[PDB]
């Protein structure tokens, strides 16, 4: 009771003050200036018409022009002029054009696009510094590769080695490979990119290779970063369709991904994470070792590892005096970490079933037998016996 009040003491006053502070300041900003900056703004608005057609800058020719490719079907030789500089632009950046006669009138985007919006996230990570136990060892391998160059680059220099680039998490479902990456990201306090690899692909053609570029482009602006491209399996060796409407799309999109990962330089400052079911849903060579270090094979919790996962859950639920910690383990045979969480959800539903406010002995025992029954084989001991 006393400490949840202390969270309230810290959060209510500081946070409530912060809203109020923003709200007055929006007025207050205006008042210091009354000419010069106001004037320049005023003529920016006369110059720039309403609406503005979006552009994408392909390239700058150094003579006060450029070439843009726009969602308007023909391309344009546009000029660079009015409240924009030649060096305020870089190629491949998104520009704002004048409706009447296309001209770069400045930038207020700088790689602002919807695919950027999905990718950047302001969400809170689900796990923070391995909240849920088990897989102690595997995290002390992600950390060596990913977290460790960011935190201390010096140690690699004494060693005289180049620092790693990226990790590949793979193997079993229900082992929380996608959640360890979230843990590592919160530990450092890095920039995290939840983009999903499957969100670049659509029926419509020719859109995809833009999207692959934009990932590497944004990641480098906000570096240091951790990039997670989750579920790069779907864009693997496989094909969209066996008829039509996708013969090209997977082929261009994957190839284009390998290229801009290597083309950065061999960096140890923008890490990638590829989350994949297996290497049998991807191409047999990726990009392909010395360059992609390290590879982490997830396999099923062992008796030690699954104990650890379980102890977390059971303590957050009523009672444990009824059926010993050991007696849960003993009854269970080795399975993924989802099966361990599943037994506890079912146990809780069973306490509801009885209409108890205690997880009784009976509830534990049934919940254990249920999961084992899904998920079953018996010809391991049938070949034998």
Partner 1 sequence: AAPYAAKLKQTENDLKDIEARIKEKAGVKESDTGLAPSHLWDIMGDRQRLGEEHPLQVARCTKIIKGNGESDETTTDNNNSGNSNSNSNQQSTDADEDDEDAKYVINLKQIAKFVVGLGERVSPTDIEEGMRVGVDRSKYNIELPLPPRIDPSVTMMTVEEKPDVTYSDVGGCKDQIEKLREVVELPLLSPERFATLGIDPPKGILLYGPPGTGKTLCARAVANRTDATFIRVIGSELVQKYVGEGARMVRELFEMARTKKACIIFFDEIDAVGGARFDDGAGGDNEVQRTMLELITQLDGFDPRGNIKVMFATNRPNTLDPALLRPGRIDRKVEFSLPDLEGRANIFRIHSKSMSVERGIRWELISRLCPNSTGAELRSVCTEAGMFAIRARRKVATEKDFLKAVDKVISGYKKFSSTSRYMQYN
Ligand X SMILES: Nc1ncnc2c1ncn2[C@@H]1O[C@H](COP(=O)(O)OP(=O)(O)OP(=O)(O)O)[C@@H](O)[C@H]1O
The answer to whether the CB of 253 falls within 8 A of the CB of 201 is yes
What are the structure tokens assigned to 79, written together? 């000029």
* Chain residues in the site for Mg ion (CB under 5 A): 178
The answer to whether the CB of 135 falls within 8 A of the CB of 178 is no
By C-beta, is 132 or 200 nearer to ligand X? 132
Placement of tokens 């680039």 in the chain:
165
Q: Strands, E, within the chain: which ranges?
A: 52-61, 65-69, 76-79, 94-98, 104-106, 167-171, 192-196, 225-230, 270-276, 295-298
Shortest distance in whole angstroms from residue 11 CB to partner 1? 5
What are the structure tokens assigned to 43, written together? 């003529």
| Other Cβ atoms within 10 Å of 200 Cβ, number | 23
Shortest distance in whole angstroms from residue 153 CB to partner 1? 12
What are the structure tokens assigned to 240, written together? 């969209």
Shortest distance in whole angstroms from residue 230 CB to ligand X? 8
DSSP letter string, 270-313 = EEEEEEES-TTSS-S--S-SSSS--EEEE----HHHHHHHHHHH
Q: Which string of x and - marks every residue 258-297 that binds partner 1 (by CB under 8 A)? A: -x---x---------------------x--xxxx-xxx-x
Q: Which does 107 bind (CB under 5 to 8 A by kind): partner 1, Mg ion, ligand X, none?
A: partner 1
Shortest distance in whole angstroms from residue 330 CB to partner 1? 26
Q: Which does 9 bind (CB under 5 to 8 A by kind): partner 1, ligand X, Mg ion, none?
A: none
Q: Does 194 bind partner 1 (CB under 8 A)?
A: no
Cα–Cα distance between 301 and 308 in angstroms, integer? 9
* Chain residues in the site for ligand X (CB under 6 A): 127, 130, 132, 134-135, 173-180, 290, 309, 337-338, 341
Q: Does 145 bind partner 1 (CB under 8 A)?
A: yes
By C-beta, is 106 or 311 nearer to partner 1? 106
Residue numbers 81-100 binding partner 1 by CB under 8 A: 81-85, 88, 98, 100
356, burial (CB in 10 Å: exposed 0-12, middle 13-18, buried 19+): middle
Q: Does 203 bind partner 1 (CB under 8 A)?
A: no
Label residue 276 left, alpha or beta by phi (over 0 means left) and psi (-120 to 50 means alpha): beta
Q: How far is CA 328 from the centre of its chain?
A: 35
Q: Which string of x and - marks every residue 290-329 that binds partner 1 (by CB under 8 A)? A: xx-xxx-x--------------------------------
Residue 281 assigned as binding residue = no
Shortest distance in whole angstroms from residue 311 CB to ligand X? 12
Residues touching partner 1: how many (CB under 8 A)? 75
Q: Which does 338 bind (CB under 5 to 8 A by kind): partner 1, ligand X, Mg ion, none?
A: ligand X
Residue 177 assigned as binding residue = yes
Which residues are documented as binding site for ATP?
171-178
């Amino acid at each position: 009771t006393r400490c949840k009040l202390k969270l309230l003491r810290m959060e209510r006053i500081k946070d409530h003050l912060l809203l109020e502070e923003e709200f007055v300041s929006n007025s207050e900003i205006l008042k210091p200036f009354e000419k010069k900056q106001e004037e320049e703004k005023k003529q920016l608005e006369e110059i720039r018409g309403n609406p503005l057609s979006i552009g994408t800058l392909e390239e700058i020719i150094d003579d006060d022009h450029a070439i843009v490719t726009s969602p308007t079907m023909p391309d344009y030789y546009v000029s660079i002029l009015s409240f924009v500089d030649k060096e305020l632009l870089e190629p491949g950046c998104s520009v704002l054009l004048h409706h009447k006669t296309m001209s770069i009138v400045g930038v207020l985007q700088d790689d602002a696009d919807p695919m950027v919006s999905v990718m950047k996230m302001d969400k809170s990570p689900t796990e923070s510094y391995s909240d849920i136990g088990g897989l102690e060892s595997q995290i002390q391998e992600i950390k060596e590769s990913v977290e460790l160059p960011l935190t201390h680059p010096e140690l690699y220099e004494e060693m005289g080695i180049k620092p790693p680039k990226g990790v590949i998490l793979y193997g079993a479902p229900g082992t929380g490979k996608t959640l360890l990456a979230k843990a590592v990201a919160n530990q450092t306090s890095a920039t995290f990119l939840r983009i999903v690899g499957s969100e670049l692909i659509q029926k419509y053609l020719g859109d995809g290779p833009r999207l692959c570029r934009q990932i590497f482009k944004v990641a480098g602006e906000n570096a240091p970063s951790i990039v997670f491209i989750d579920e790069i399996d779907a864009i693997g060796t496989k094909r969209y369709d066996s008829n039509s409407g996708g013969e090209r799309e997977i082929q261009r999109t994957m190839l284009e991904l390998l290229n801009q990962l290597d083309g950065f330089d061999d960096r140890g400052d923008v890490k990638v994470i590829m989350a994949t079911n297996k290497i049998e849903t991807l191409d047999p060579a990726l990009i392909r070792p010395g360059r992609i270090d390290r590879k982490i094979l997830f396999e099923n919790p062992d008796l030690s590892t699954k104990k650890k996962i379980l102890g977390i859950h059971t303590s957050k639920m009523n009672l444990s005096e009824d059926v010993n910690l050991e007696t849960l383990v003993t009854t269970k045979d080795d399975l993924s970490g989802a099966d361990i969480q599943a037994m506890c959800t079912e146990a809780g539903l069973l306490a509801l079933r009885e209409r108890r406010m205690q997880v009784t002995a009976e509830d534990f025992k049934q919940a254990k037998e249920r999961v084992m029954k899904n998920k079953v084989e018996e010809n391991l001991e049938g070949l034998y016996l």
